[PDB]
Amino acid sequence: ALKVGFWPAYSVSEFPPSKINSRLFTHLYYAFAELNAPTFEVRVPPGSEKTAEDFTPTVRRLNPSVKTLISIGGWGSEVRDNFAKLNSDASARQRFVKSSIALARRYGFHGLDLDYQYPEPQLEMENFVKLVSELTAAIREEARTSGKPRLLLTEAVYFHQKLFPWEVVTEYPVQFIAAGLDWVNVMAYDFHGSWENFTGAPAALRDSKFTASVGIESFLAAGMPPEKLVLGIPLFGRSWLLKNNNEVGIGAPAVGAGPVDGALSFSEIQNFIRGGAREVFDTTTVSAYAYKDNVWVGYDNQQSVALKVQYAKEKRLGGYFFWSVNQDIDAILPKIASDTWG
Ligand SMILES: CC(=O)N[C@@H]1[C@@H](O)[C@H](O[C@@H]2O[C@H](CO)[C@@H](O)[C@H](O)[C@H]2NC(C)=O)[C@@H](CO)O[C@H]1O
């Protein structure tokens, strides 16, 4: 029963690792170590060494059984560019593999995660396969030589097994992934946002082709063992500015990104509601939204999270993950999620 949370190092001054309620998790990720092109000596951002070192001892104080992983990469054009350069170069792949394993041990992490959005087109999937295969072997080798349990290995995946469902450029090799990785983190969010001029449920469980369930279905149909899938749930919402203040439902016309640049933390959504926004639960999509004047935000709330976590349990998944834990300062949704699975 995997209860996973991502902590982004950017949030340190407002949400240090000590603020994480680690009682509500089995695994916590430090996001992110950098690829460090062109040498690919993987490292935490220079100047954050102390934060990275203290992360695991700090979170374990509240729940000593909690384990940690360090995630490499993250969303971003530069990260994608760097994985693409890395994966085509056998020597660079060797440097990456050696340095990433050494990094996890250096800072006391129990595993590694690759956050690569995304290994497409086909050539990029093929070269990512080379990187991951070599990493899996090196992880097993380090376990033998050190005598310690092998590092865990996970990766972020698109919500769907096919990249992309509308135009198939490539797809995740599920048998390969099941063999080399402990699990994958299914990014079942950002289905809708301010890039569309109409409001929608950004992480709809069901509805449309862009839903968490359809994505999960696609991985299972391909032959992914259910226990290898960990369902992502966002701790942020996607916001729009409304074209008309009297049109406030799902599918309402919009004119651009709401605060803050199209994304709002769950905690800020709670502030929004306490400041007069109306919360609506949408049963059709299994989601929530809130609005006030010209601002509209779609997100997951207490009810939709419980429904998603039960869904994951029903689908026999390995568990769930939250992106990202700093966005729910009072850990409202991680509490509901943990209680639901138990
Ligand atoms: C289901 C799907 O393919 N959704 C796409 C969105 O992912 C994407 O939005 C972007 O998602 C990133 C991570 O998923 C975010 O980091 C990023 O902020 C977000 N971009 C914006 C402008 O909000 C959109 C836009 O490219 O396309 C969807 O198809």
Q: Residue 190: how many CA atoms within 13 Å on its side-chain side? A: 13
- Alpha-carbon span 334 to 305, nearest angstrom: 9
Nearest to 337 by CA among 323, 319, 315: 319
CA–CA distances in Å: residue 176 to residues 42, 100, 183, 184, 228: 24, 20, 12, 12, 12
Structure tokens at 159: 């919500």
Q: Whose alpha carbon is nearest atom 6 of ligand 1?
A: 190
Q: Are residues 196 and 118 in the same domain?
A: yes
Query: Residue 254 contacts by C-beta under 8 Å, 6 or more apart in sequence?
Result: 194, 196, 197, 198, 199, 240, 241, 242, 243, 296
Structure tokens at 339: 């209680």
Q: Are residues 273 and 240 in the same domain?
A: yes
Q: Are residues 337 and 280 in the same domain?
A: no
Helix 332-341 to helix 302-314 angle (10° resolution) is: 30
Query: For ligand 1, which residues put their CB under 6 angstroms from it?
Result: 75, 159, 190-191, 193, 195, 210, 262
Give the number of domains in the chain.
2
Q: Dihedral, CA atoms, 311, 315, 316, 319, nearest 10 degrees? A: -40
Burial of 216-243, coded b for 16+ CB within 10 Å and e otherwise, reads: bebbbeeebbeebbbbbbbbbbbbbbbe
Q: Whose alpha carbon is nearest atom 2 of ligand 1?
A: 191
Q: Are residues 143 and 282 in the same domain?
A: no
Q: Which domain holds residue 254?
A: 235-299
Q: Which helix (H) or strand (E) holds 53?
A: helix 49-60
Q: Which amino acid appears at position 285 of this protein?
A: T
> In the chain, what's the furthest Cα-to-Cα distance?
66
Ligand 1 atom at minimum distance from 210 CA: 1
Structure tokens at 63: 């729940």
Nearest to 194 by CA among 266, 260, 150: 260
- Alpha-carbon span 287 to 305, nearest angstrom: 8
Pairing state of beta strands 278-282 and 27-33? unpaired
**Structural contact between residues 233 and 189, judged by C-beta atoms closer than 8 angstroms:** yes
Best residue among 190, 195, 235, 264 to mutate for probing ligand 1's pocket (most ligand atoms within 8 Å of CB) is: 190
CA 335 – ligand 1 centroid, Å: 27
Q: Which of helix, strand or coil describes residue 166?
A: coil
Q: Are residues 243 and 328 in the same domain?
A: no
Q: Are residues 127 and 252 in the same domain?
A: no
- Alpha-carbon span 169 to 118, nearest angstrom: 11
Nearest to 136 by CA among 153, 122, 149: 153
Resolution (A): 1.6
**Structural contact between residues 289 and 299, judged by C-beta atoms closer than 8 angstroms:** yes
Task: Name the DSSP class of 126.
Answer: H
Q: Is 316 exposed, middle or buried (0-12, 13-18, 19+ CB in 10 A)?
A: exposed
Helix 212-222 to helix 302-314 angle (10° resolution) is: 10
Q: Are residues 168 and 313 in the same domain?
A: yes
Q: Are residues 153 and 225 in the same domain?
A: yes
Q: Are residues 136 and 154 in the same domain?
A: yes
**Structural contact between residues 309 and 341, judged by C-beta atoms closer than 8 angstroms:** yes
Q: Are residues 265 and 143 in the same domain?
A: no
Residues in the chain: 342
**Structural contact between residues 117 and 80, judged by C-beta atoms closer than 8 angstroms:** yes
In the numeric block, the tokens 């039960």 are attached to 310
Q: Is 113 exposed, middle or buried (0-12, 13-18, 19+ CB in 10 A)?
A: buried
CA 190 – ligand 1 centroid, Å: 5
Q: Are residues 230 and 293 in the same domain?
A: no
For residue 90, what is the domain's CATH number?
3.20.20.80
Query: Residue 271 contacts by C-beta under 8 Å, 6 or more apart in sequence?
Result: none
**Structural contact between residues 213 and 256, judged by C-beta atoms closer than 8 angstroms:** no
